[PDB]
Write an enzyme that holds these catalytic residues in place. Structure first.
Site, short mmCIF file in Angstrom:
data_model
loop_
_atom_site.label_atom_id
_atom_site.label_comp_id
_atom_site.label_asym_id
_atom_site.label_seq_id
_atom_site.Cartn_x
_atom_site.Cartn_y
_atom_site.Cartn_z
N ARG A 191 0.80 -1.03 -0.04
CA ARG A 191 -0.17 0.03 -0.19
C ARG A 191 0.86 1.41 -0.06
O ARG A 191 0.63 2.35 -0.65
CB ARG A 191 -0.97 0.11 1.43
N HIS B 240 0.55 4.40 -2.99
CA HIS B 240 0.36 5.69 -2.52
C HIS B 240 1.68 6.28 -2.99
O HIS B 240 1.52 7.62 -2.69
CB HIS B 240 0.09 5.69 -1.05
N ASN C 92 -4.14 8.73 3.72
CA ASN C 92 -2.71 8.06 4.42
C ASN C 92 -2.89 8.19 5.91
O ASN C 92 -2.41 7.45 6.75
CB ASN C 92 -1.47 8.57 4.10
N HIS D 132 -5.89 -5.66 -2.99
CA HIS D 132 -6.90 -5.91 -1.99
C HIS D 132 -7.29 -7.45 -1.51
O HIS D 132 -8.16 -7.77 -0.94
CB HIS D 132 -8.41 -5.10 -2.00
#
Ligand code: HEM
Ligand SMILES: [Ca+2]
Ligand SMILES: [Ca+2]
Length: 306
Positions: A38, A42, A70, A170
């Site tokens: 993740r 990001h 975040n 995911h």
């Protein structure tokens, strides 16, 4: 341009050091692999994969760690510091934080049972952080499919395969109750739960996330295999069991004519998914990188070299 062999002469053992760090961390924190992937995502969606997300506050610019996507979510920063320190010992001032995080993401996926491949390397580290850009560029769980598509295109990923494949991230990891409360009790001010959420699973989720309960409580993204990196994520979508709105939208959106066949193809074959994931991952990893003499090889991922 980026190449998988960038450190084969200067730091041949970088990938092994990164792997060892994650393996050790996984024993105490089984969620770390998901967390690291993740972080990379990001990182890449804000000015490219330049480790800008790893920078802490300064009086001149705010940290991306306080972005809506975040704050109170992104994690694993100390783990990245650990591997960076280990790598700096093995090969001083050689591996950029941007590349380190990319390798960490790939190794995390592999350790979790996903595909194994050599990521392109040669990225350099940003000279600043971009909080506003992060708030504008990071997609949100309440995004509709058109919005999800727009968010990916905005950073350079035009293909629906990019979106469907990368969403496979995911297949493991956690999500806070906060992000599905609308789907469970009042979706789009309808006063009803999201109709695209399987009613049996709806009951389960309501039990984990009761109305007026702890919004910070965590739920697994994949009810089939919570910590294993596999194609089960897509099998879930086909049964209306995607956890967040953005997951289910890939299969149920009125605009899903192009994504439905991709979801099915990945649900039907692990190889097809893994292949598409690696391809999409490398494309995301190729988003506006700093290379050559641009940017720096940050020594401490939290601060720009001075
Ligand atoms: C398509 C749009 C996407 C949206 C809107 C989205 C949204 C979210 C949200 C809401 C969370 C929960 C955060 C929390 O509760 O703390 C999350 C977690 C996570 N996401 Fe995404 N995500 C997207 C795409 C991706 C992609 C492209 C990847 C990586 C390839 C990814 C990997 C992860 C992982 C592994 C977690 C779990 C992290 C952990 O448990 O520490 N996501 N995402
Ligand atoms: Ca970035
Ligand atoms: Ca899984």
């Amino acid at each position: 341009q980026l190449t998988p062999t960038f450190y084969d002469n200067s730091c041949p053992n970088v990938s092994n050091i990164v792997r060892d760090t994650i393996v050790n961390e996984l024993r105490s924190d089984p969620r770390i692999a998901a967390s690291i992937l993740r972080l990379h995502f990001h990182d890449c969606f804000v000015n490219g994969c330049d480790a800008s997300i790893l920078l802490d506050n300064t009086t001149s610019f705010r940290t991306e760690k306080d972005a809506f996507g975040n704050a109170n979510s992104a994690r694993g920063f100390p783990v990245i510091d650990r591997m960076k320190a280990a790598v700096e010992s093995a090969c001083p001032r050689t591996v950029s934080c941007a590349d380190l995080l990319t390798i960490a993401a790939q190794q995390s996926v592999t350790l979790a049972g996903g595909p194994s491949w050599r990521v392109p390397l040669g990225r350099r580290d940003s000279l600043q952080a971009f909080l506003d850009l992060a708030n504008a560029n990071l997609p949100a769980p309440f995004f509709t499919l058109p919005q999800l598509k727009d968010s990916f295109r905005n950073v350079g990923l035009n293909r629906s395969s990019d979106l469907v494949a990368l969403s496979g991230g995911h297949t493991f990891g956690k999500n806070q109750c906060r992000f599905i409360m609308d789907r469970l009790y009042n979706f789009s001010n309808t006063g009803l739960p999201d109709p695209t959420l399987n009613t049996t699973y709806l009951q389960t989720l309501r039990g984990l996330c009761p109305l007026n309960g702890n919004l910070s409580a965590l739920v697994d993204f994949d009810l089939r295999t919570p910590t294993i990196f596999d194609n089960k994520y897509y099998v879930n979508l086909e049964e209306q069991k995607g956890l967040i709105q953005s997951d289910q939208e890939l299969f149920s959106s009125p605009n899903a004519t192009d994504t439905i066949p991709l979801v099915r193809s990945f649900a039907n074959s692990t190889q097809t998914f893994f292949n598409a994931f690696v391809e999409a991952m490398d494309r995301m990893g190729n988003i506006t990188p700093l290379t050559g003499t641009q940017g720096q090889i940050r020594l401490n991922c939290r601060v720009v070299n001075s």
